Design a binder for these strands. Structure first.
Ligand SMILES: [Mg+2]
Ligand SMILES: [Zn+2]
Lengths: 361, 131, 38, 141
RNA sequence: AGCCAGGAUGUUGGCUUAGAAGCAGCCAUCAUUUAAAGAAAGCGUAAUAGCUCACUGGUCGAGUCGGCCUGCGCGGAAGA
């Protein structure tokens, strides 16, 4: 009896899923297609193609060979454990532990590769949550959702910084922006962008009347201080002005917002870190470009990046979550992962939806 | 390079070679190709390494300076690139017949080689010497 | 050829020449180094 | 007939032949049949350890006759196998790898001079240690 | 200063999970044989065939190579 073998059983079935993700058949089919095209006598005569054919080769060789490394590797680890239990070699028991873990460390190498983290997915990011309509019901949902995310990253260890927070009227905000410092911080949060539906009996009306509130959240990364493509001039606009009341221990003890707009395509960012006007406008233009950066990536998806124009515009990830409090049923509209624990996911038990969003993102 | 200070030490090393040696034999790499180099280096590092230095400093004031102690008749072999090679472990060894065999192997163009008169012989390659 | 008030050897093959008093700078390598005046 | 017509050096593996995938460009520009090159190394590699890095030397004659000669594995990878740590040196004497005894160096230098040339085993050991200090490898006796 | 040659074996050059047969990035910078050869001067480059400078010998066999203090000149200097 060995629970390590019970993990070898678990890792192998997961490996079948890891093979089930990448379409392991077509991986070996395409890799031989790069092989046949390099036999072509004009490899040296097509230089740019040659560096590209090697690029198509080397990118798959780090995956297909690893997939075959996990194939023949696991079969030997399947041998080294069962030989150890049936012969009682204490070192063979000790070595098989390192033999199983390294395969998971290859599964961990596939983990970031399956996540296909590119541009700024390994970097920190910013949040942007807007309140819906209907007075106090919307701002509470703005608040309760935001303060769930604030209690979320603290459990994961991501440093949180409220860049800007604009309180609506009665217990809640209308817009908020939070900087999330962390490794792969954009990677764990990118897929949460969209509109989040709240369904509950409102506490604001006598009787009952289950009310449906809406609120959206927008996650845009940190663009490495410069994208390397500055589209600055672009009808720039500064509007720096005093904010609500600095009452007692109000946010950052600043009340000095820097409202900056990007008139073409209508992008609006703002910052409320410090009293130094020149400091905030420096930080706000950083996120203005980042918000402009996510606009540039959506255009690729708008053509032929990941939409698959088959019949029509296959997408519209606006309604991505539904939070029904009085039925205790949280449903994700992108995968269908459901959970019957409201206060747990109101505390930050969102890993079940991250893996759900990791699949289609 | 330098003055007489560095110029003599190479000759003093040749003085160390004439201390117990005999039958100096020479070659001529005035035009020596890569393989004429590849032979004369890889063979020189692996044959003995001690006497197979290619001392082609054959000026009539430089190589003549090498021989005021053993066989001053070797002062005649100044011109037409000359690189001395005595034999330290074997007095009058195979390295008289060997260079002729080197010319019978790859060294076709080395047209000034004769070998010196320690045992009083020249140009004509010999084999009645203990190889 | 390049014309300047200050001419100098840009490479190792280019040499100096005083053709008809006019200081020139011929070059056996890249013709981009041919200079005049100076 | 004569010396050479097409002189190359290839094969960074010891049991993996594969004519067309990695060697394909260096076969057609050298007048080499793929399966002939695939099996000629296999005609030699069975007696030596397979999977390791062992180079080759190819000479082509004017009558299309391929004569192949193997060499010794490099210093930087064999010592990487002698130490077992797959690393180099990003920074010279900052990215350190691990120590190698002169007794470990003695078996190597005697083998590096078995397929290649040299004069002294210790002089070859200094050459290995010269490349060792060049790879960020700490060396002991 | 030319005319003739070498410019090699070294670790097929090692590491940022792109590649480097003296040359794009980061590096070293220790040798071997050493008359002497730097992982280096410029290009041919998916590291594709090579020719040369460093340094060193043979022949001719005399002076030569630069820097500085300065006299007098040249170019820079095109208008109605
Ligand atoms: Mg003047
Ligand atoms: Zn020039």
């Amino acid at each position: 009896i060995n629970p390590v073998n019970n993990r070898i059983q678990d890792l192998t079935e997961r490996s079948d899923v890891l093979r089930g993700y990448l379409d392991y058949d077509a991986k070996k089919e395409r890799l031989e297609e790069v092989n046949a095209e390099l036999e072509q006598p004009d490899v040296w005569n097509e230089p740019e193609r040659a560096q590209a054919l090697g690029k198509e080769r080397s990118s798959l060789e780090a995956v297909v060979d690893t997939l075959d490394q996990m194939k023949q590797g696991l079969e030997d680890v399947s041998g080294l454990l069962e030989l150890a239990v049936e012969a009682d070699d204490e070192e063979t028991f000790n070595e098989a532990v390192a033999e199983l873990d390294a395969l998971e460390e290859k599964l961990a190498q596939l983990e970031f590769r399956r996540m296909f983290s590119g541009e700024y997915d390994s970097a920190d990011c910013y949040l942007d949550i807007q309140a819906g309509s209907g007075g106090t019901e919307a701002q509470d949902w703005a608040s309760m959702l935001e303060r769930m995310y604030l209690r979320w990253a603290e459990s994961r260890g991501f440093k949180t910084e409220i860049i800007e927070e604009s309180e609506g009227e009665v217990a809640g905000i209308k817009s908020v922006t939070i900087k999330i410092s962390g490794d792969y911080a954009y990677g764990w949060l990118r897929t949460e962008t969209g509109v989040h539906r709240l369904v509950r009996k409102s506490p604001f009306d006598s009787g009952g009347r289950r009310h449906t509130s809406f609120s959206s959240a927008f996650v845009y990364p940190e663009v490495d201080d410069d994208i390397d493509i500055e589209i600055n001039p672009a009808d720039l606009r500064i509007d720096v002005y005093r904010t609500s009341g600095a009452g007692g221990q109000h946010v950052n003890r600043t009340e000095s917002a820097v409202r900056i707009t990007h008139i073409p395509t209508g992008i609006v960012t703002q910052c409320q870190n410090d009293r130094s006007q020149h400091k905030n406008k420096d930080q706000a233009m950083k996120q203005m470009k980042a918000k402009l950066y996510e606009l540039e990536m959506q255009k690729k998806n708008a053509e032929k990046q990941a939409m698959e124009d088959n019949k029509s515009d296959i997408g519209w990830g606006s309604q991505i979550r539904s939070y029904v409090l009085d039925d205790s049923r949280i449903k994700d509209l992108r995968t269908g992962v459901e959970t019957r624990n409201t206060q747990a996911v109101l505390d930050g038990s969102l890993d079940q939806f991250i893996e759900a969003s990791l699949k289609a993102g | 390079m330098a003055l007489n200070l560095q110029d003599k030490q190479a000759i003093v090393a040749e003085v160390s070679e004439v201390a117990k040696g005999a039958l100096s034999a020479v070659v001529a790499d005035s035009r020596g190709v890569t393989v004429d180099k590849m032979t004369e280096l890889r063979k020189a590092g692996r044959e003995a390494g001690v006497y197979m230095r290619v001392v082609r400093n054959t000026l009539l004031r430089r190589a003549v300076e090498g021989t005021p102690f053993e066989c001053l008749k070797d002062a005649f072999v100044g011109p037409t690139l000359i690189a001395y090679s005595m034999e330290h472990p074997g007095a009058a060894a195979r390295l008289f017949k060997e260079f002729a065999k080197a010319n019978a192997k790859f060294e076709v163009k080395a047209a000034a080689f004769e070998g010196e008169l320690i045992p009083a012989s020249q140009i004509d390659r010999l084999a009645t010497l203990p190889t | 050829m390049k014309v300047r008030a200050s001419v100098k050897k840009l490479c190792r093959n280019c040499k100096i020449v005083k053709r008809d008093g006019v200081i020139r700078v011929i070059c056996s390598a890249e013709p981009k180094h041919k200079q005049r005046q100076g | 007939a004569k010396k050479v017509q097409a002189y190359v050096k290839l094969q960074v593996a010891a049991g993996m032949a594969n004519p067309s995938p990695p060697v394909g460009p260096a076969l057609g520009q050298q007048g080499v049949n793929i399966m002939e090159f695939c099996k000629a190394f296999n005609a030699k590699t069975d007696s030596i350890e397979k999977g390791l890095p062992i180079p080759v030397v190819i000479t082509v004659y004017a009558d299309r006759s391929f004569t192949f000669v193997t060499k010794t594995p490099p210093a930087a990878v064999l010592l990487k196998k002698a130490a077992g740590i797959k690393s180099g040196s990003g920074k010279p004497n900052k990215d350190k790898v691990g120590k190698i005894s002169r007794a470990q160096l003695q078996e190597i230098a005697q083998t590096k001079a078995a397929d290649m040339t040299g004069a002294d085993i210790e002089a070859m050991t200094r050459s290995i240690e010269g490349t060792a200090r060049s790879m960020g490898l700490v060396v002991e006796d």
